[PDB]
């Protein structure tokens, strides 16, 4: 009977692949052949933030595109003012094994977690003047791979036990659980409206979830190995995934299939972070070969390279207004490029 | 050029910077050990000998004027490939292994495979291992009862504690391909005296001496 279920699943997969092939009449690259190349993009480092004493594992831009939080497993959450390079806050964490950080859209809270299996929320605007942890959300059983704020009271966290979760910060309990992944979840990406989000896991599949009802809508396959990063296209109808196969794949929610692959035989290192520009014409891919790359999303040819780091680019982000791109590496230096 | 209210911000930035620099200076004097094992490998026994939160558990203590911070990954139940690289800078890797599990695909072979995987690693090409061999008191009666060859088909020798233990030790220590850039210490940890902590202290002293030599340039 189990063999019967497996056979039915395989037949369903075959039917789905056949349907996708029937719907894959063309690809993005050909229809954009008449668009002139963006040219050689040569960004320069306008700032360098040097306060961390260990590897940088997460950074997140503020909604005002000036302040940014960054987490390092020296045990510190440092909030930088990128305009003036001043350290606004330096929160000491209870567990130094931080793997993720979040800056609330309102700017009032930050969140971080990691191998401690707990997501801690820090209140930045307490009257006492000292940042203090307001809630320790403990309902996971694995490392907190990522976390993101829906608002000042809702947070989504994807963990290493293969389940994502939606929390109620005030009550400290788990509001909803998102199950359906087979391998560890490595990233999260809220949609522009924050109604639905995509999570990438080690199964090489990115799953679409609707926050309110807590179901899974779609599964996107096409990667040959794990997915390290996932970014939502600003339009909110597509998202780009970076994988260990040195390939960045563009996926569409409506078509439910891959639109483009950004790779060339020269580069054989896995991705670590992916992010789009404000207009979506550029895809910024942080690599483990120490060199960030800038892909012309409409042409797939390398628009440029960002080589200013001496270790893995662990995190990459773009200001909400698209003015600058912050890259944080394992050498403890953030660099703002523009 | 700077507003009267911006120089205060710069002063706060500098004060935070000099606070976190001294915090890192303090952290640089901590001996970070990573505890590893499998099943009932006696890791609880090692913690007891030394002496709410799922995942990594940190235990800090001081012995003979040195501060140890033992990180027991414990029940992570997750792909180690995605969270082991954060321990690249650890000082030493304590590795507990049961010797009464030679009877029980085998538990000894599982431990051996885990040891090989975590010893020959992209990130632990220099960190020294400290192998603990637990439960020798019980393994004594177990080897008196049944032969060890049931676990090692190639084993050739007598069915005695000293030789069985020597063979197990040699089999574990032969798994490291890079014998020149990292050493594998060993101690039959069932010893209930303070030797259990003394051996770790000696191994960490040797490792830090080697690191200091490498920095100075002698090595």
């Amino acid at each position: 009977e189990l063999d019967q279920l497996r056979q039915e699943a395989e037949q369903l997969k075959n039917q789905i692949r056949d349907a996708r092939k029937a719907c894959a009449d063309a690809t993005l690259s050909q229809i954009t052949n008449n668009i002139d190349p963006v040219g050689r993009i040569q960004m320069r480092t306008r700032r360098t933030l040097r306060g961390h004493l260990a590897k940088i594992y997460a950074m997140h831009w503020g909604t005002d595109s000036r302040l940014l939080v960054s987490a390092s497993q020296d045990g510190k959450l440092i909030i930088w003012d990128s305009y003036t390079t001043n350290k606004v806050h330096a929160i000491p964490l209870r567990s130094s094994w931080v793997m993720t950080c979040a800056y609330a859209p309102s700017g009032n809270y930050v969140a971080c977690g990691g191998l401690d299996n707990i997501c801690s929320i820090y209140n930045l605007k307490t009257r006492e003047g000292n940042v203090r942890v307001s809630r320790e959300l403990a309902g996971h059983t694995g490392y907190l791979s990522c976390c993101r704020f829906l608002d000042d009271n809702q947070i989504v966290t994807s963990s290493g036990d293969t389940t994502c979760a939606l929390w109620d910060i005030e009550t400290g309990q788990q509001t909803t659980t998102f199950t359906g992944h087979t391998g560890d979840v490595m990233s999260l990406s809220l949609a522009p409206d924050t109604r639905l989000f995509v999570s990438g896991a080690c199964d090489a599949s990115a799953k679409l979830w609707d926050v309110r009802e807590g179901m899974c809508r779609q599964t996107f396959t096409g990667h040959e190995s794990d997915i390290n990063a996932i970014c939502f296209f600003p339009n909110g109808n597509a998202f780009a995934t970076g994988s260990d196969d040195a390939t960045c794949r563009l996926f569409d929610l409506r078509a439910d299939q891959e639109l483009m692959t950004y790779s060339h035989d020269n580069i054989i290192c896995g991705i670590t972070s992916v992010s789009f520009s404000k207009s979506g014409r550029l895809l910024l891919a942080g690599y483990d070969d120490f060199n960030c790359n800038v892909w012309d999303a409409l042409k797939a040819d390398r628009a440029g390279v960002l080589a200013g780091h001496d270790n893995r680019v662990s995190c990459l982000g773009v200001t909400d207004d698209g003015m600058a791109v912050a890259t944080g590496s394992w050498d403890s230096f953030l660099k703002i490029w523009n | 050029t700077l507003s009267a209210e911006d120089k205060a911000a710069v002063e706060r930035s500098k004060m935070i910077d000099r606070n976190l620099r001294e915090d890192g200076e303090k952290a640089a004097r901590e001996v970070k050990l990573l505890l590893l094992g499998a099943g009932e490998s006696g890791k609880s026994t090692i913690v007891k000998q030394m002496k709410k939160t799922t995942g990594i558990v940190e235990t800090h203590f001081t012995f003979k004027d040195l501060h140890f911070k033992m990180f027991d990954v414990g029940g992570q139940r997750s792909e180690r490939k995605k969270w082991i690289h954060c321990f690249e800078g650890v000082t030493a890797i304590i590795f507990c292994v049961a010797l009464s599990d030679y009877d029980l695909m085998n538990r000894m072979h599982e431990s051996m495979k885990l040891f090989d995987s975590i010893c020959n690693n992209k990130w632990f090409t220099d960190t020294s291992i400290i192998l603990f061999l637990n439960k020798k008191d019980l393994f004594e009666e177990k080897i008196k009862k049944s032969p060890l060859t049931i676990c090692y088909p190639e084993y050739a020798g007598s069915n005695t504690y000293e030789e069985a233990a020597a063979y197990i030790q040699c089999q574990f220590e032969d798994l490291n391909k890079r014998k020149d850039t990292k050493e594998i210490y060993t101690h039959f940890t069932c010893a209930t005296d303070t030797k259990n902590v003394q051996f770790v202290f000696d191994a960490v002293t040797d490792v830090i001496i080697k690191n200091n030599l490498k920095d100075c340039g002698l090595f």
Partner: antibody
Framework: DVQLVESGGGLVQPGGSRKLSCSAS????????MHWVRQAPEKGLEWVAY????????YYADTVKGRFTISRDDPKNTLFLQMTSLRSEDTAMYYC??????????????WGQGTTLTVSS | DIVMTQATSSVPVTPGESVSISCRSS???????????LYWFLQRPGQSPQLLIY???NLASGVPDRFSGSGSGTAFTLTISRLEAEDVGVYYC?????????FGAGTKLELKR
């Protein structure tokens, strides 16, 4: 709750000296810069002194420079203003004010209840 | 120093009606970094002052929303949309662009009957 309780006020002859104390409770005293601001009887406010966080920078009003010394004991959560060569114009209510300076902070967000100093012969 | 000028007193107004308090500085308070450094404080009868506005447009925590700040580089206004019996007292404008910090004369908002 945040509290700044002042003490040391009273009657002083002209030319004397007096120490005003500000006991801070309910907040991280060491993270805040501090100000002393004086209000003359039936008159407006006048800024007197400022001591940064950690005592790294100090400023005085020209009317008091050289005569007042501002200090802080962080371990005891206390702020001190020692006044020497008091004049008749120095009679007033002295307020202890906290002020934290960074991006987006709100300086001058809390004032003490003030202590009355009467410099008269 | 920077000289802050206000009216000695404002016309008394009834509760529920809007009211405005003006202040002006001898020099432009608009720093090159975009921040206009000006703070508005309230001192009620027999009490210590308390911050109302900081940097000319930002409402301090715990202050009712009716209070609002505005103004150009060298002219500033604090508006109370609907007065209450608890708004009576002295309103001070203070500049933080350069040391020393110079307050204003203080406008004494008082009720009408």
């Amino acid at each position: 709750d945040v509290q700044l309780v002042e003490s040391g006020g009273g009657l002083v002859q002209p030319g004397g000296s007096r120490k005003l104390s500000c006991s801070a409770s309910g907040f991280a005293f060491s993270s805040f810069g501090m100000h002393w601001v004086r209000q003359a009887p039936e008159k407006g406010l006048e800024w007197v002194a400022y001591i940064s966080s950690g005592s790294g920078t100090i400023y005085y009003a020209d009317t008091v420079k050289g005569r007042f010394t501002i200090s802080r004991d962080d371990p005891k959560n206390t702020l001190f203003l020692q006044m020497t060569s008091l004049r008749s114009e120095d009679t007033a209510m002295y307020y202890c004010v906290r002020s934290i300076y960074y991006y987006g902070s709100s300086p001058f967000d809390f004032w003490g209840q003030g202590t009355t100093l009467t410099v008269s012969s | 120093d920077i000289v802050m000028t206000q009216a000695t007193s404002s016309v008394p107004v009834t509760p529920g009606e809007s009211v405005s308090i003006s202040c002006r500085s001898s020099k432009s308070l608009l720093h090159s970094n975009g921040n206009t450094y000006l703070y508005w404080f309230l001192q009620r009868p027999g009490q210590s002052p308390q911050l109302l506005i900081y940097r000319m447009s930002n409402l301090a925590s715990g202050v009712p929303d009716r209070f609002s700040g505005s103004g150009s580089g060298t002219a500033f206004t604090l508006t109370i949309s609907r007065l209450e019996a608890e708004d009576v007292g002295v309103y001070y404008c203070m500049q933080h662009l350069e040391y020393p910090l110079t307050f204003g004369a203080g406008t004494k908002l008082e009720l009408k009957r």
